[PDB]
Ligand binder design. Structure first.
Ligand SMILES: Nc1ncnc2c1ncn2[C@@H]1O[C@H](COP(=O)(O)OP(=O)(O)O)[C@@H](O)[C@H]1O
Ligand SMILES: Nc1ncnc2c1ncn2[C@@H]1O[C@H](COP(=O)(O)OP(=O)(O)O)[C@@H](O)[C@H]1O
Ligand SMILES: [Mg+2]
Length: 186
């Protein structure tokens, strides 16, 4: 047994349960969870200049351009709360963001420890998103987000192939939590 100070990526399509498990893992491991969707939504609700520009992209299910997202994650990781590890939820979502992340962490003398892919069939995703009812959880937006995932984000499974663990993310919250912990060796 080696300690809990880890840097974990959760990768997976919209609805895979990433936000859900990131909160549970953050509590268990004693490290913050960081959601790029959450940070954009806060910017939007405080009406920042970033919020104003990001909203067109969030509303449509598109990714916010990478220059804005990379800068935002770089800034968040400057918080001393993230100094002994973190769980990232929804970033990186493209190979460009993965290379940008590598640079950010290298500057700070560290790197990613583990990468968990939340594997969930599309039928399950749809039922979950329809039950969630967030603003972007509509049929046309969900379709776009799925294409976004396939086109931009799914290539990360190959990029992180050496660190990747796939989790059967269909089951109870407790079931999936235990599976994610086994994947982390915890
Ligand atoms: N194991 C699970 N079983 C059933 N529903 C779940 C499970 N995990 C999460 N959910 C629910 O499904 C929806 C999507 O979960 P969420 O964690 O927001 O996914 P993501 O962050 O991957 O888009 C939420 O309404 C959430 O409460
Ligand atoms: N890494 C990212 N790069 C670009 N845009 C992002 C990123 N993360 C989140 N966003 C924007 O925020 C939206 C909501 O993200 P998220 O909360 O992660 O959705 P979900 O919880 O369903 O996985 C995304 O559809 C996108 O418009
Ligand atoms: Mg989420």
């Amino acid at each position: 047994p080696r300690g809990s100070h880890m840097r974990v990526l959760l990768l997976g399509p919209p609805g895979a349960g990433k936000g859900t498990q990131a909160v549970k893992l953050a509590e268990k491991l004693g490290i913050p969870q960081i959601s790029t969707g959450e940070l954009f939504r806060r910017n939007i609700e405080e009406g920042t200049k970033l919020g104003v520009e990001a909203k067109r992209y969030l509303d449509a299910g598109d990714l916010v351009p990478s220059d804005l997202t990379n800068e935002l994650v770089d800034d968040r990781l400057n918080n001393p709360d993230a100094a002994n590890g973190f769980i990232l939820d929804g970033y990186p979502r493209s190979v460009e963001q993965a290379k940008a992340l590598h640079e950010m962490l290298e500057r700070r003398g560290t790197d990613i420890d583990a990468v968990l892919e939340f594997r969930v069939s599309e039928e399950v995703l749809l039922e979950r998103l329809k039950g969630r009812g967030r603003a972007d959880d509509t049929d046309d937006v969900i379709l776009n987000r799925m294409k976004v995932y396939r086109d931009e984000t799914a290539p990360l499974l190959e990029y992180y192939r050496d660190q990747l663990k796939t989790v059967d993310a269909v089951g109870t919250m407790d079931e999936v939590f235990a599976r994610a912990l086994r994947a982390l060796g915890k």
